[PDB]
Design a protein around this ligand. Sequence first.
Ligand SMILES: *[C@@H]1O[C@H](CO)[C@@H](O[C@@H]2O[C@H](CO)[C@@H](O)[C@H](O)[C@H]2NC(C)=O)[C@H](O)[C@H]1NC(C)=O
Ligand SMILES: *[C@@H]1O[C@H](CO)[C@@H](O[C@@H]2O[C@H](CO)[C@@H](O)[C@H](O)[C@H]2NC(C)=O)[C@H](O)[C@H]1NC(C)=O
Ligand SMILES: *[C@@H]1O[C@H](CO)[C@@H](O[C@@H]2O[C@H](CO)[C@@H](O)[C@H](O)[C@H]2NC(C)=O)[C@H](O)[C@H]1NC(C)=O
Ligand SMILES: *[C@@H]1O[C@H](CO)[C@@H](O[C@@H]2O[C@H](CO)[C@@H](O)[C@H](O)[C@H]2NC(C)=O)[C@H](O)[C@H]1NC(C)=O
Ligand SMILES: *[C@@H]1O[C@H](CO)[C@@H](O[C@@H]2O[C@H](CO)[C@@H](O)[C@H](O)[C@H]2NC(C)=O)[C@H](O)[C@H]1NC(C)=O
Ligand SMILES: *[C@@H]1O[C@H](CO)[C@@H](O)[C@H](O)[C@H]1NC(C)=O
Ligand SMILES: *[C@@H]1O[C@H](CO)[C@@H](O)[C@H](O)[C@H]1NC(C)=O
Ligand SMILES: *[C@@H]1O[C@H](CO)[C@@H](O)[C@H](O)[C@H]1NC(C)=O
Ligand SMILES: *[C@@H]1O[C@H](CO)[C@@H](O)[C@H](O)[C@H]1NC(C)=O
Ligand SMILES: *[C@@H]1O[C@H](CO)[C@@H](O)[C@H](O)[C@H]1NC(C)=O
Ligand SMILES: [Zn+2]
Lengths: 901, 6
Amino acid sequence: SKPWNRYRLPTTLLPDSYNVTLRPYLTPNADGLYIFKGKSIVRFLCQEPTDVIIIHSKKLNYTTQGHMVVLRGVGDSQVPEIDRTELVELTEYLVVHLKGSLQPGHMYEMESEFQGELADDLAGFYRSEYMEGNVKKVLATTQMQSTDARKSFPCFDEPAMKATFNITLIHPNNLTALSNMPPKGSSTPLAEDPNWSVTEFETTPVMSTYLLAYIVSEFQSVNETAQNGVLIRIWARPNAIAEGHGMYALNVTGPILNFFANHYNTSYPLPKSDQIALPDFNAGAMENWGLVTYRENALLFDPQSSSISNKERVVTVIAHELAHQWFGNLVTLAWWNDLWLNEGFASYVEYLGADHAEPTWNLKDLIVPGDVYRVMAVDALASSHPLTTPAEEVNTPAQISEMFDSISYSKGASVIRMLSNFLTEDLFKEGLASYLHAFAYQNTTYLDLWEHLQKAVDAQTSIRLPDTVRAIMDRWTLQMGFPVITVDTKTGNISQKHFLLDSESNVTRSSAFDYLWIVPISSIKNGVMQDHYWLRDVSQAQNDLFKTASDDWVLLNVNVTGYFQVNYDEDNWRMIQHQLQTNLSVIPVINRAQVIYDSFNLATAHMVPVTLALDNTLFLNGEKEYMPWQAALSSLSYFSLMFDRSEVYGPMKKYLRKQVEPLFQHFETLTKNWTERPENLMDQYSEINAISTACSNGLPQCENLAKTLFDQWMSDPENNPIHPNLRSTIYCNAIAQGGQDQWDFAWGQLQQAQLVNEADKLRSALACSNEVWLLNRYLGYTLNPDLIRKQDATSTINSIASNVIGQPLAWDFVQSNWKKLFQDYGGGSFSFSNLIQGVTRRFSSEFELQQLEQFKKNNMDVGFGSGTRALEQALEKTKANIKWVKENKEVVLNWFIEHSS
Amino acid sequence: AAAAAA
Ligand SMILES: *[C@@H]1O[C@H](CO)[C@@H](O[C@@H]2O[C@H](CO)[C@@H](O)[C@H](O)[C@H]2NC(C)=O)[C@H](O)[C@H]1NC(C)=O
Ligand SMILES: *[C@@H]1O[C@H](CO)[C@@H](O[C@@H]2O[C@H](CO)[C@@H](O)[C@H](O)[C@H]2NC(C)=O)[C@H](O)[C@H]1NC(C)=O
Ligand SMILES: *[C@@H]1O[C@H](CO)[C@@H](O[C@@H]2O[C@H](CO)[C@@H](O)[C@H](O)[C@H]2NC(C)=O)[C@H](O)[C@H]1NC(C)=O
Ligand SMILES: *[C@@H]1O[C@H](CO)[C@@H](O[C@@H]2O[C@H](CO)[C@@H](O)[C@H](O)[C@H]2NC(C)=O)[C@H](O)[C@H]1NC(C)=O
Ligand SMILES: *[C@@H]1O[C@H](CO)[C@@H](O[C@@H]2O[C@H](CO)[C@@H](O)[C@H](O)[C@H]2NC(C)=O)[C@H](O)[C@H]1NC(C)=O
Ligand SMILES: *[C@@H]1O[C@H](CO)[C@@H](O)[C@H](O)[C@H]1NC(C)=O
Ligand SMILES: *[C@@H]1O[C@H](CO)[C@@H](O)[C@H](O)[C@H]1NC(C)=O
Ligand SMILES: *[C@@H]1O[C@H](CO)[C@@H](O)[C@H](O)[C@H]1NC(C)=O
Ligand SMILES: *[C@@H]1O[C@H](CO)[C@@H](O)[C@H](O)[C@H]1NC(C)=O
Ligand SMILES: *[C@@H]1O[C@H](CO)[C@@H](O)[C@H](O)[C@H]1NC(C)=O
Ligand SMILES: [Zn+2]
């Protein structure tokens, strides 16, 4: 095979440094084509003799004099003549065939001139269009991750092939140019046309291609100079800056960077930090070294209209991206198969960095609902996959893209947190420092971190492990899934088995370990911490730590630091329940949530009866804290989805109304009649969920609150009296109770909304009407770009479908309008998969299955496109629902009847 | 954007 037909680069040539000059043209040509021009020189060293240069190039046209490149020797080195240059599209290469061989130890410079489309494709060097008044603005920006640096200039575009970069931007003289590094000095006029300026940037450190960035825009900044001279700037649209929306990001950045410099035992490795808010950046955020990009909703914050969960999103997303400025950027994983270590690490430490900026919020707890239980839903499937993938199976750009999923990020985070916990943070930080210092400006595999952590373990006598760090972590990284740990408290016997939600599933992926793990197990007995225990790679063991007396109780996995779920014999469950009903504060709040999370999953897997899971919600009438209530609500939304059109619903409603009333009443006093929010984040979250649960289950005191506040708003439109935290519930319930006066008022507010997040809440609340006619009229609007944006059409139809009354209307509308498929699957995506999922989510009967089959019977032309598999998934999900309702209906009805009084 | 929602 020829090397230019292989996806991995040769190792014969390694880059030293690059000069790259880019010039975006932000005015289109005659035909509406936007382009950029560039010029580059790469200096590389020959390691082994070769008569071919292979370098990456994607969607670039070459205008170099002669062949596509010019090739020179550095210093007094001679250079072979070029035979020919060709582009090989499949493997994204520019190939320079030479008439003789390059020589080991010699350096060469390769110069090229090129151009590409400055497309609106969020890839490489690209354009982004947005509105300022009647005016349409266009800026130029970059997204290299993973394999798109090559789409902006020819480069050895693999993460381990690091080099220094000298970037220059040629741009309109009234626009600002930003890159990884500071400008060298003031811009100078382009001599051939002084309407353009030339901005040169300081040389980057040795770094990876995927982390480069350069941006040309009208943006402005808010700034601060940290004590060590590091300049910090938040960049955004002029009007966003003037509004003060960059201030929260600016406030937290300084503390976050200080936290990480200390955590990592390493100085921030750059002279400045720019972070930029881009309108509609669909990738969310990108950790470009010294110039981190974000979508606006992720970086900007409007105190007057934004909720607290909004603030939580800003501080954690910043902490995540800043974490990479060391872990990922300074020390880079050598290949994409180890992506999980980079993203998993940042996904864990984002909570630590954010906790430093907001220390009263207990943010570290949020990893449990946010990543652990979230990823366990997909890792408890037969179709999961290990964190680890062999390097040689990850080759194409598409294979690289598949590394970026829930397992890599959320299981990565969970497993790393588990590791830090069983090591202790102090020891983990020691190894982490050692790793960063040894590999700074270089590349690694996950085995290198384990080695440095082992060095830390071996240098102390306190923490003793049952095996090497690598052998333990291999159990968590080389095989998919996680165990359920089951304890028999009468004997103290403990067992582990691979946990699958579907007790009838066939696992066909084989494990080198037979799905046995080495498991760290903390425990608490009658509210007192016990000695730590390790379950070895055995199915079964026994320890007196897990043996109780019938008045005692024991609980495993404190704070769910371990990546596993726990089951007990029935008597121990009842003892835990008794404790939660008589003095809950003895069980850590995270474990009060765990009991609910785990037991609903166990009931799904048929390991406990569903009534045991429901019994675990009974303590909630005395619960004031956020997480355990959130656990219940996440675990019951499926119950509500299946039963909200059945005789089960009244009793379920009555049951939830009874559980939530004391909490609603608690906050009524605490908030001084809803006039002031709880102080800390968790309590604000608890209040939000309490109002939401109250209103949606028909608590009269909540309905009355919603009506009063919305009435008050309608009588004084410019002064919204509803705190951002409570808007989504208050808006929804007031519209549900009301009619066309409320609906028309909210529609008018939607059409003048300036802020995306406010517009979203309104769009969602409008779907809460209980008038069939209003919902059909609304559906009719969803396909009009004048009234409802394209990108919002399917969300809106979905919100309507989630209304019990809107369910038939949306389903009818989708079936009947399906042929908006020969109109919306050609110019722009239009997520069809999410629409199918959304409107079919409820289906739980044979009759509904028939309709979905009957409907599918229209493959005869049309097809489905982006949602072809989504439809198949809807048929399989409906069958699973049919079977679940049949097994569960009778038992669940009687439980709710029995416990609603 | 990379954080991790609950
Ligand atoms: C990018 O700019 C840097 C820094 O100015 C250049 O580094 C110089 O390179 C030469 C080797 O050609 C060294 O002798 C000098 O000592 C370097 N200066 C410094 C400050 O390191 C670098 O060569 C440039 N890259 C390219 C491709 O030209
Ligand atoms: C890469 O760019 C740098 C900076 O423009 C070039 O170095 C400059 O070379 C000019 C002559 O063209 C001199 O005025 C300066 O001595 C250089 N400036 C600095 C900061 O070193 C460099 O020659 C370019 N690299 C290559 C291989 O052409
Ligand atoms: C930068 O200069 C450009 C070119 O004059 C300005 O772009 C024009 O701006 C007005 C808006 O008042 C439009 O009517 C023209 O269509 C724009 N021309 C182009 C080619 O886009 C721009 O306003 C100036 N921006 C700043 C920040 O000074
Ligand atoms: C990827 O990283 C490895 C280190 O893990 C680099 O290998 C080292 O190169 C440095 C020079 O900076 C030498 O000091 C070390 O002796 C090497 N250590 C080894 C081999 O363990 C390697 O250079 C990197 N790969 C590339 C292409 O740069
Ligand atoms: C389990 O998690 C809780 C927090 O949810 C831990 O309690 C925190 O402990 C640290 C250090 O003592 C304090 O800074 C916090 O103020 C505590 N928060 C609360 C709400 O009490 C607790 O230490 C963890 N349990 C174990 C065994 O590690
Ligand atoms: C690249 O060249 C092709 C073929 O000549 C042409 O269709 C395309 O527009 C060119 N693109 C740019 C950005 O110049
Ligand atoms: C930023 O910090 C200042 C000073 O502490 C504070 O007044 C302001 O409320 C903060 N801004 C935001 C949006 O939190
Ligand atoms: C790294 O940690 C050591 C040990 O506490 C300390 O003396 C040193 O100041 C630290 N260096 C940095 C850059 O944090
Ligand atoms: C507990 O394990 C012991 C030792 O293997 C065994 O004799 C016993 O049957 C187990 N009992 C239960 C109830 O699991
Ligand atoms: C509940 O437990 C905590 C911790 O032991 C203790 O402070 C308190 O006295 C207990 N309260 C009641 C009412 O049992
Ligand atoms: Zn990340």
